Design a protein around this nucleic acid. Structure first.
Ligand SMILES: [Mn+2]
Length: 121
DNA sequence: TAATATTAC
């Protein structure tokens, strides 16, 4: 529906490598992927406190590139280093997004709606 | 976890 607000599941990513593999798992992920930055080689009430975020926007028609661009700005204070946003389909064929964000600084997310996004149509 | 939802290492 027009001008829907999209709320993500926000998690601190436990293993960025596994998350990136997981969100690029589909054979056609290449044309459904937006990327920015350089991948960080990581060394091994609501609150998330991490440099590494794994976001899932269910039932979400946002273009990966525009989700990425807007998350870069919403997370700007934490100095994003790498973002990958990928569209996949639910079983019923409707789209959703997954995003991996790697920041320089640890983000303290206490508002669960902080990464909500509205689509411009 | 909240708070979208069946998608989420
Ligand atoms: Mn998926």
């Amino acid at each position: 529906s027009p001008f829907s607000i999209f709320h993500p599941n926000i998690q601190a990513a436990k293993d960025c490598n596994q998350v990136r593999d997981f969100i690029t798992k589909e054979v056609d992920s290449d044309v459904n992927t937006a990327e920015w930055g350089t991948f960080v080689a990581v060394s091994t009430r609501f609150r998330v406190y991490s440099k590494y975020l794994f976001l899932t926007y269910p039932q979400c028609t946002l273009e990966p590139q525009y989700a990425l661009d807007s998350l870069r700005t919403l997370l700007n204070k934490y100095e994003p280093l790498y973002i990958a946003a990928v569209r996949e389909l639910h079983e019923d064929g409707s789209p959703h997004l997954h995003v991996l964000v790697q920041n320089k600084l640890r983000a303290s997310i206490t508002n669960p709606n902080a990464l909500n996004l509205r689509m411009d149509t």
